[PDB]
Amino acid sequence: AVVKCKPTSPGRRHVVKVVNPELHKGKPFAPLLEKNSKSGGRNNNGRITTRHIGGGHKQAYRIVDFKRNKDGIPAVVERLEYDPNRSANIALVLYKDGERRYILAPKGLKAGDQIQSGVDAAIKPGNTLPMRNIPVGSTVHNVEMKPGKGGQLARSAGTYVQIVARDGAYVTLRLRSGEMRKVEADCRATLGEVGNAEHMLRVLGKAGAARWRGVRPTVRGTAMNPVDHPHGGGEGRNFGKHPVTPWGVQTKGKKTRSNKRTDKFIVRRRS
Amino acid sequence: MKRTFQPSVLKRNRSHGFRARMATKNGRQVLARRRAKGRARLTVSK
RNA sequence: CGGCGAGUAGCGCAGCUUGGUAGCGCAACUGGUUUGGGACCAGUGGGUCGGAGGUUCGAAUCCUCUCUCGCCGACCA
RNA sequence: CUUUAAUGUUUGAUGUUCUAACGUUGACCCGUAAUCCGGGUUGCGGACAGUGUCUGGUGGGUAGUUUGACUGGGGCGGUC
RNA sequence: AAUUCCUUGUCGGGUAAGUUCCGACCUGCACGAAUGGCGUAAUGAUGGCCAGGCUGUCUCCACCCGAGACUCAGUGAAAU
RNA sequence: GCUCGCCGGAAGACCAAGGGUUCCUGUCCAACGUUAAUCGGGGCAGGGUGAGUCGACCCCUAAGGCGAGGCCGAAAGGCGUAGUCGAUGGGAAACAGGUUAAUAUUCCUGUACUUGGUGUUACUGCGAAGGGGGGACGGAGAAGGCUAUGUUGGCCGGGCGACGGUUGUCCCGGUUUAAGCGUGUAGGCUGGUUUUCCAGGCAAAUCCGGAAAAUCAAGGCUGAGGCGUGAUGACGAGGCACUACGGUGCUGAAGCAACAAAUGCCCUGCUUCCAGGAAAAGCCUCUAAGCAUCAGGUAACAUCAAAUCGUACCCCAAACCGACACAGGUGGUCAGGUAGAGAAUACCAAGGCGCUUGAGAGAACUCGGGUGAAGGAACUAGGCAAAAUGGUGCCGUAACUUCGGGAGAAGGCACGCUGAUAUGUAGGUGAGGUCCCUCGCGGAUGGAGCUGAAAUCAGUCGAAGAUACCAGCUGGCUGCAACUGUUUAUUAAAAACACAGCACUGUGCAAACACGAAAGUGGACGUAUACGGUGUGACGCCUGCCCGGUGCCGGAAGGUUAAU
RNA sequence: AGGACCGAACCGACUAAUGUCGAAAAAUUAGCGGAUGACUUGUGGCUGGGGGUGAAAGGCCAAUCAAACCGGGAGAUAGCU
RNA sequence: GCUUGAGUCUCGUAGAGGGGGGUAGAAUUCCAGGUGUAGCGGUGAAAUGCGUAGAGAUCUGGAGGAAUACCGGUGGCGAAGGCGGCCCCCUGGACGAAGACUGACGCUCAGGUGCGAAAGCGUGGGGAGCAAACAGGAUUAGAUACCCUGGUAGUCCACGCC
């Protein structure tokens, strides 16, 4: 449920746990389980690359099918699950004559439903289909980028991307960030929004809930001394500067998107 | 008040060892800087 | 005891680079308009630059020391 | 000369279409019992992108230094 | 006020006695909106203040156990 | 050798780390030991470490490391797939007694287990670098059943007393036994099974995953503790034979039940919650290429091995690390009795020790302590210290408040011990008989026996009954921080830092941003309900005004302008 | 249920005395905070000197830190005792 | 026991009654391009703001957004507050018509629970027009206003509060 935690003591005073009563309280379905070896901040050259981050409680990453290339075999959704990785919880779906597999729960599904991916399926919560054979003006998610990659677009909990128009052999997509883009019409996507759709107000409530999630404490730049971050130093909380990153680029400002190998495809950027 | 030389002879052999100093380039430099002086203590082998 | 800042009528200011004529806005006051104040529509009176100088072709102006009021620093062991 | 019409003929600007170098952290067999890579198909970008050299800009993210002297201690304000 | 030097600002209160302390005045030399304002239950090896308790902290020290000091034999350095 | 002291979740006993003869015997006392020394962890000499089963090696991985061909790199060298390494984890198996001057689960006595090899015989479809299953898991929290272990009694052996009484309700001592094997229980999960099929596991598949008719409600897996074989054997208080002062050798009774009882075991079991809880080999079944009488694998049995090294001693200390016979610092297991909620504390057991300078006198002064007449913070920078309350059960609990807290607000009430309730009740566990009896380690009933609160009265003693150890000072306001937390390891613990939250802003994926000449990885096997960065910092009441200047974010009219 | 409450082991180290050529190149003896959590510790890896890491003091990287250590440059140079 | 109270049951009839999904036209303010040039907008009159970096104007292609001209009539419903497109779903009340029927079950109701426009608030969506705030331009003796150019909270949806 969307429960409000009855505030006994400090540190239960602000917690709210957006929880499902029907997420299955048992186990991950083991044959889709590879482990993860934690690598907080440090690449294979050691040497902490990303700050701000660290360890926290152990995870066992779930192998999630994203391409959905079965294209013509019906699929019974067995149960939902909580793969702790993304935000968008996962539902184990077995197919007609065999293999059992995890897909993203698209918010409209309760377990037991039939779904089918392909170019020849219905228009329902949980069917994936390539955008040549799509209803225009819909609202979909899990969009691919190339016809065969598998998906990079709107797969975080609750979100969605609205197809707006057909550009002939191209399909333009209204992204939920403000920018919108143009991809060729032969990319594959699933109707509707993803599950865990009210994860947005998951308050943690306490230092404690963060540090076993993986976020690790970061100190303000005017706190530091000036040999450590350009804002550092100051006799009594004095900024006197213009807000830049650790390494120098001014933030709260300059739009550093300059990949240019992608500027062909943005129809209307974000104002 | 734990004191500094907190010993372990496996950590003294994975690091200061022979096979720790014969593999790379600048371990072999060390063994050549020692046997030019020519002393019986060239590594930590025991 | 010491820098920067000046004093132009009751009140507060341009005239001061590179000396040449004492103007200006709002008061006291008097009037037009209205039955009457105030306001608007306009004017009269109000100084020889705190003061003493020397200097000089004539000094508020050019400088120096004072009366007073601003302001800047008056720090280290 | 100001100002217009076409012609010959030479640059430069800008856009569409294209494939052939190049790009490909797209898929797919093979080397190979291998989410490395290389090789060949196929799809998509496409003369842009990336990089080389030259070049203005930006550049405390860094590096090298510089920040007078008499002075009734030094600083101040002078003086040079 | 943790900012207000100037000032013990001046009044109420607590004391027989109040530069700190609680409540306001406004004369903010120089509070005041995220270099965040005001308020805030709980919490704090926290910052002052007050009453009750309680005691050698004090008037004023008095005795008294035990380890050293001191004496003997053994051993026997160090700063300079 | 007697006597007295000290520790007893330790200064006791066993190990890893580490050290490397310090272990035992005979001798030596010149140096070493904060003195001596017939002494020692000091010197000389001899002597001491027995493994198929503990560990290591070994089969296999994790973080991670080298890293063939490679991509890259000015040389070096940086990164990485295949692979091959790396336990603080998974893979085979031993326990009881005795014994050495000194080692043990090693050797001798007894009972046996474990994985391989060969082959007589009986069978006969087996066989991966392949597939599947398992091994494969978290945190917390109770509660049920038991064992370690202890306690009381019975039995059994010896005793009855160096001053009063102690022939019995009396003192003291011992009442030990494993692995394995047979029977499977309290207890947990689970529907088995037969036929016919399947575009699933890169192919294949009599396996497994799925889909369908039949079929009755069972089979099975895991399983502390118990009960007998183990054991007419050993062990066993003690007394006797000998008497080398060490002691040597035979003999040796009882060996019971009940009350308790864990933090250990069933428990890799189960309820529940979000923060979603390691990978491969051993073992197990099923196929491919082959061989298909032969060869391989299964089962019974006989027989033969189990290479190597570590082990001595200390191991909360005089032996490791601290220049040292240093009040210091190091991690894991076992855990006794009486009061006790206990692993607090108090006093003791087994068991180790009396901290390698002793003997006097009893100045001032110093250090650690005890009480202190009357007074009570007068002292002082300040109640710093020191003092004092200090315990379970029952009541009685403010302003304020986020309604939880506050608050163990404050504040008082009874405590010992004997008898009576009752020759020790409630409650706990609970044999036989009896009865049905899926002939059982059953299930009801009955309750002997054995422990044992708590509670009420009388009465009695102290001056004081939580009597000692141990064991909350207390409220009235206010500044700052929301709060638990962290920091200057070694003069700074708070107002500093983080914090959940709020916001701005960047980021559309070969992401931005970073570490690297570069390859590359991190970010993220995540994809704008997410990521970076910045700022302020619970929730509550709120977020005024200036876009100048500095700087970003849009614009491309003009002026100006590098290279060529 | 709890970064819950009093409170041991353990982790830390606010208070006063001793020590301060000491028993110790920061500890002891009493009182003190946390004490199933943002927990402590055990072992084996990873990170590099204008670089590493940092719940951010310019603290920590072997008794040394506003740029560790050893060797080489190097008899650096010193107008100053 | 009664039926004229009140209430049931049976065919239907009219409607902006309520809640929920989607949907259609006109038209404004922007996004993009072509034709095209000194003015657009504005109220009394000006000046801010827009514009020769080519606006306004119109035409072509999209964007959401909110209101649903006309039908609209002191017209129909609701206890009230309030309700105006269409469409499908669910569903509430008023009333006529005659038969069968329970046979006073009625009226009111401090306590009480519930509903209740507008703004106002909390959390997450949203954004055209319009508009508190606010700014500048006039106006004015002053103008913290009426006017003008822009614009923020909000206006709107789900869901709690008020």
Residue numbers in the entry:
A (entry chain b): 1 to 271
B (entry chain D): 1 to 46
Copy out sentences from the published article reporting this entry, exactly as the authors wrote them.
Structure VI lacks EF-G, but the tRNA positions and 30S conformation only marginally differ from those in Structure V. With a slightly more swiveled head (18.9°), Structure VI represents a transient translocation intermediate following EF-G dissociation. Novel states in the 25-s dataset with the most translocated tRNAs and most swiveled 30 S head capture a transient equilibrium between the ribosomes with EF-G (Structure V) and without EF-G (Structure VI), suggesting that EF-G•GDP can dissociate from ribosomes prior to the reversal of head swivel. Our structures therefore suggest that in the absence of inhibitors, EF-G dissociates before or during reversal of head swivel.
After peptide bond formation, the pre-translocation ribosome contains peptidyl-tRNA in the A (aminoacyl-tRNA) site and deacyl-tRNA in the P (peptidyl-tRNA) site, which must be translocated with their mRNA codons to the P and E (exit) sites, respectively. The structures visualize how nearly rigid EF-G rectifies inherent and spontaneous ribosomal dynamics into tRNA-mRNA translocation, whereas GTP hydrolysis and Pi release drive EF-G dissociation.
